[PDB]
Design a protein around this ligand. Structure first.
Ligand code: WQC
Length: 133
């Protein structure tokens, strides 16, 4: 019953500061513009101890499966090759990505009927709000 309130299909409804977050991470101009238009569907499921998060959009389709606390390799939608660890901290999914001596953290939280995604790179935060699909 790990992660029950996250499971489901979610659709992006608002974004703030995502272009700047992508700049801070190192994403180039053309990718930022096309990625920033996307309105992904995020599909979260659990089977035993394995959590799967899929993102489907007209920019990219991604899929990660993982066990909490257990590092895994990930190729991000912007084509970074990162080492990721996802944990639950106080009911918040905390996803840390490490590459080239850099680090970014993506937090996913249930707030009212929404799923709120906060992405942080250095001093730059972006907030992305998803609704049930
Ligand atoms: C989601 O699409 C893109 C496009 C280009 C870079 C990235 S970095 C990974 C992140 N995914 C979200 C999220 O809202 O699910 C926020 S941060 C993602």
């Amino acid at each position: 019953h790990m992660c029950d309130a996250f499971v489901g299909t979610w659709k992006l409804v608002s974004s703030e500061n995502f272009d700047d977050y992508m700049k801070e991470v190192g994403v180039g101009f053309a990718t930022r513009k096309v990625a920033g238009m996307a309105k992904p569907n995020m599909i979260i499921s659990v089977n035993g101890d394995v959590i799967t998060i899929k993102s489907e959009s007209t920019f990219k389709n991604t899929e990660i499966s993982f066990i909490l606390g257990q590092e895994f390799d990930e190729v991000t939608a912007d084509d970074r090759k990162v080492k990721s660890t996802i944990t639950l901290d106080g009911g918040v999914l905390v996803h840390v990505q490490k590459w080239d001596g850099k680090s970014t953290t993506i937090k996913r939280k249930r707030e009212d009927d929404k799923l709120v995604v906060e992405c942080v790179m250095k001093g730059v935060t972006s907030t992305r709000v998803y609704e049930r699909a």
